[PDB]
């Protein structure tokens, strides 16, 4: 044979696992996958070097199901794949978002991984294979990275976790999240729940981390056979040869002149290592003020959330409409009534997708005074609005008690921090000023870790600041009754499972102190729907 | 409150008017304007200094119409707005047109205007409510626009003028024109009409100009109580450190030549500063000679058109076809005719618009012997079909006596001066070789006006060049009745009712010169349609 | 008149052909031709000058069919033509592959050909009209192109071969070829053909080449009535002031960064003047090499052709599937099986076209170990599916014998070699996995040609190297019966009858050692077809 075939086989959980390499595409780093009816190729490409004035890392990955995966031919576009589905975008954030951290500080070669699910039975998703195929091609592919990575999705049946459901496990589960760590640490937690507690959230996400441990094992010993060795890549050296005044401007736009302003005073006064230091500067300024308890840039201590402004009906003509300003992250959110017509219809593997409600998320340049050049949606304007609609799913009224479409837009005019749990919050609001009725109001908080050693600091509802410097950033939304959705992205290590249980407490301190000025203004849905919505009658007259 | 909300409310004819910021989009320049049913949110962004070797001044401008304004879903895209409508393209373009003279010469900070409707009950345009709030949006932004700007629409019902008319007026109005001006000018120009006559046009701008001062004076009340205070930046100084001889080559192609060839002579001799003084240099000279009373360019006088050639029925199975040479200026226009099947339908927020006809305009860049890369309609192609569309709107037979879908094309094949007008003609002349009868044929001219101090001249059909030193480019496409269609764009103080009275009757009687040419081939529609056009039979067999 | 119309007539084979310059877009190198039922506009745009670091020659050929050229209006898409259809993209490639090499070397003006049909009675197909008019306006162009070219169809009817037949011709024709060539040389051919022999391809080449000629002789003529002068350009010249050892490195990973190494290295010692000189002495070793008889760059001979590996049933859930590897070439292909509703649908000048087969050709940059942008289809994606399935189509089932709907699909895995031809045999495999009942089965072969005066070589299976320096480059498919696709490119003078004679025969035991290797694996379809496909049953009954 003209192969030099590596195979490792494993059992996880409930499906067969085999991790192949040496036979197709041998060119690039690639593993072929399959897990239970569903297989994925995984190609990875490391650029040799790092291109000459490279100062980020630029990684990139695309995820794309093929129809004929399943038999299928694709749908009324040339016969053609297309663009990625938004479907397929959310994958590609899901392997992104866990091995983007995983790469040194300063290793600017470019990434970019192609995951292609090239056959499919139609029994559950193609995401988790998807994430192992992408932690195995990594490991073999040469580069720096820290990985192995796992992965798991956890449900929830009969009040116990569920390792990787299927489609059939997942329609009764209270539980949909996907967790991703390394061997020793959880680094990405993507979630949608049905009001379950901080504990039962906690558990899942441990339950995950300690389920896939074989999966990273077995990647491990992949690696090994294929002639994986060490990296011995070294992170250049720096040039080794008052801060705290501009971090005590509270205003976001005069904080940002003040320190644009002191950038060009250094540049005047001292190319590539003056951005590189002066950044790394305020970086560790800002750091080192949370961790020795100071006030934050804005004053507040580390679990006030900013002052809060709640209306509802503030546009004539939309079904519902509300505006939610935390500080200055702000979202005009409204809802719109449907008839059968305005369903949102999708291809899938599995077939067509109709679904009567949709959430649609919009961050113009302008809600952080900038310009920007006009786009369709971006990755991240899926993924938040995605997020938000998975903070809104539970408290839904079940469509044979409430025959309407719904559609949900958030426009963000103002954003400093989390707009998507803004988004949580005036989608519950409008809603309700739709006349939906909700079987609780849900609201969001954006919450930050800073860590150093022993030492750590929780920070309620952080500001844009903020998010730069923490080395956690976790979401909640939820009732009153528990969470409906829980996000987490790590990059270090150490972070317990007692640190995350006071993490999640005083995220829902914060959360209830949300959601009490939101019932000050509308605590119910309106008792009938609004006034312009199409009406639901048992006989119309067409003219 | 944690806003610091400032209002004025006004009345604007027969609608209330509202003017509100500091409570939505406070890190733009943002108003929240409501005008009758309409509300529009436009947020500018103004970048605080000039990029490092911008030349030229970087404005963009996006109106947005959102389905939910109207408690509408959007219509299978995904449920998306997706991209810029033709019609959003249009609104664009009039609100860009007013304001971008309205900079200062040498200020090259990147300016962005952001309009969205955000709730309209579907009664009138939204247009005149977005250009105030840019208007009032660019008030409050600190730079140095010369505003405010006003804006009106003037319809004509039973003789008399009517300020922004709705859908339901507009269905009786003989004229369809938008103007917009300063205190003291009038700007821009856009206008549809039953084909009226000068003096009606000209009265109809006056009327708008005299009616929007009531709401300049709002504006400017408005952003003194906003805090807004003058600018005080100052437009940087120059280098203050024959010519005629190239400008008398005639050929378009030679004289660039010439002139380019010109400018490697003075960077040889002699950066930017060459490039903005070897310009103005020849900006003064074409200019003087203008207004001195030398002849033009390629050698006419002020009002002499260009030669004409006028031919039809030149595309064997284009149902019917015409090439239109107005010197450099060439177009070749087609009449497709078509069943019901073929007509244009889109969205707008009152509903689904079918239109049985539509006018597309392609400007490809071998038209000006040049390369060009390859894209979708531009700004400028949807905005010159759609004048060339207002100028042959009014002579189109009724759908009950001429019940086919009709497409014209007009491929700009040369340009050197208003292919827009050179569209119109031979829209009209393939429109009769098609066999449609017209109420009567139509031509546009270009038209320039050269001013200073108290001296002017007035020129007819414009070279490519006469077009970039005008400080007055108008349009009119008319029969021999009247004017079907008005364009004006003037960036000066001090053009009159006079002096624009003087301009018009020079374009009038050019528009009579060129369609007295076109009559000499054809005058009337052929008495049958095209042998190729599908026939309309009251008993049609399928087999 | 205002114009100086130059026009040339001549009788070309069954059509009236008639060149016409100097009335439509004067301002480009334009020709209007009609040739029978066809008219086509051709405007060249040559820019005068090189740009300052242009190191490629930048040409793009846009060719377009409007639907108004038959009566027809746009469907569905604002009633606008849109971006390139695929059939569009196809002709756009049969334009510029003749065109490319006939500018000299060193010419680095931009070149730009719009192509557009302005009248058609759908007879026939408007791409050699197109191809005249191309010629023609190159010809008038003032540029060093080595022109004119001429093009012609061939088929086959009853025996006979049959110059430009239009459609209804072509449904008798057992040949769909279209050759373009100078006064004295082959330059491009692509074809289709039902298994015929090399004898007959071979001749219906030879026959085009020399049908054409008359039309050549007449665009001399009118280019030279047009006032077409000689070019006066030079080509600079080159600062004139071992090599074999990398070019022995067989694993093409390890030969290419022995190679960019080695570049490094001459720019250390010794910028554009070293980049184009290092290339000519890779260009210059290999091809001695071959000449002189010394074993290819892998060790090869000139007629050996790569090691094979031929896999079936690769995929679970495809209908059919294919891993087809030749050295380091690789295709991953499915057929997948449909009902009605796949069927591909596309609009065409003559009508509404549905078509049961569709192949799709897929090439990321993984296959080459490389990083890229994601994008739509290409247009050399486009070309190479369209080759292979000319490679395929001879041998597919009729529709009223096996009435499903069919789609391949060609994953381009590796790459080091006409992946196109991989992926002939690739469907070919996957059709007979899919139990798809083939004529017979096919495979394909990419060959190369090195010349120097009478010297030449032959080489069997080309590498991606040999295809870079190549001065003949061809790729046949076909069963063991004869010739299903023939595609030539020609870039050098002398290739003689015999020649070719000899470079065919060579491909034939080429392309049969291939198919020799794909029957030990599968050489009949499965007697079913494959569980998961969709089954067609006289009683349907749908819940």
């Not at 589960?173 to 959880?186: F, I, P, R, Y």
């Not at 609780?440 to 929780?458: D, H, N, Q, S, T």
């Not at 006071?502 to 995220?507: D, G, K, M, R, S």
């Amino acid at each position: 044979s003209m192969f030099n075939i590596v195979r490792k086989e494993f059992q996880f959980g409930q499906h067969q696992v085999v991790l192949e390499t040496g036979r197709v595409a041998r060119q690039a780093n690639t593993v072929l996958i399959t897990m239970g009816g569903v297989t994925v190729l995984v190609a990875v490409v490391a650029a040799p070097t790092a291109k000459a004035g490279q100062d980020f890392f630029p990684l990139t990955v695309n995820y794309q199901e093929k129809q004929y995966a399943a038999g299928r031919i694709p749908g009324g576009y040339g016969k053609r794949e297309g663009r990625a589905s938004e479907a397929e975008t959310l994958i590609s954030r899901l392997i992104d978002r866990p091995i983007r951290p995983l790469f040194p500080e300063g290793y600017y070669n470019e990434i970019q991984v192609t995951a292609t699910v090239v056959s499919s039975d139609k029994t559950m998703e193609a995401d988790i294979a998807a994430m192992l195929g992408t932690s195995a091609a990594l490991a073999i592919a040469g580069t720096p990275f820290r990985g192995p990575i796992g992965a798991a999705r956890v449900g929830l049946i009969n009040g116990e976790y569920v390792l990787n459901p299927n489609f059939e496990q997942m329609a009764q589960s209270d539980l949909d999240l996907v967790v991703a760590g390394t061997e020793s640490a959880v680094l990405m937690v993507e979630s949608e729940a049905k009001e379950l507690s901080e504990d039962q959230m906690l558990g899942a996400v441990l339950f995950g981390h300690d389920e896939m441990q074989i999966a990273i094992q077995a990647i491990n010993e992949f690696a090994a056979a294929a002639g994986a060795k060490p990296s011995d890549w070294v992170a250049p050296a720096h040039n080794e040869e008052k801060i705290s005044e501009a971090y005590t401007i509270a205003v976001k736009q005069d904080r940002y002149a003040a320190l644009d302003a002191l950038h060009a005073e250094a540049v005047a006064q001292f190319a590539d290592e003056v951005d590189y230091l002066f950044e790394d500067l305020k970086y560790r300024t800002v750091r080192d003020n949370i961790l020795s308890g100071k006030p934050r840039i804005d004053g507040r201590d580390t679990k006030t959330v900013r002052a809060l402004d709640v209306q509802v009906g503030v546009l004539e003509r939309a079904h519902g409409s509300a505006l939610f300003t935390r500080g200055e992250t702000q979202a005009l959110v409204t809802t719109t009534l449907g008839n059968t017509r305005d369903a949102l219809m999708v291809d899938t593997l599995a077939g067509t997708k109709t679904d009567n409600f949709m959430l649609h998320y919009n961050f113009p340049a302008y809600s952080v005074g900038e310009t920007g050049r006009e786009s369709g949606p971006k990755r991240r304007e899926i993924g938040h609005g995605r997020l938000a609609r998975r903070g809104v799913q539970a408290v839904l009224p079940a469509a044979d008690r409430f025959p309407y479409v719904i559609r949900i837009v958030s426009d963000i005019t103002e954003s400093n921090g989390s707009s998507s749990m803004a988004s949580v919050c005036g989608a519950s609001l409008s809603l309700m000023d739709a006349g939906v009725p909700l079987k609780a109001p849900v609201a969001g908080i954006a919450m930050g870790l800073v860590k150093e050693g022993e030492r750590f600091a929780v920070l309620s509802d952080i500001l844009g600041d903020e998010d730069h410097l923490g080395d956690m950033d976790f979401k909640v939304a939820g009732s009153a009754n528990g969470i409906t959705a829980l996000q987490m992205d790590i990059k270090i290590e150490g972070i317990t499972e007692e640190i995350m249980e006071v993490a999640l407490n005083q995220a829902f301190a914060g959360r209830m102190h949300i959601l009490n000025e939101m019932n000050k203004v509308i605590s119910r849905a309106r008792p009938e729907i609004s006034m312009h919505a199409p009406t639901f009658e048992v006989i119309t007259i067409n003219p």
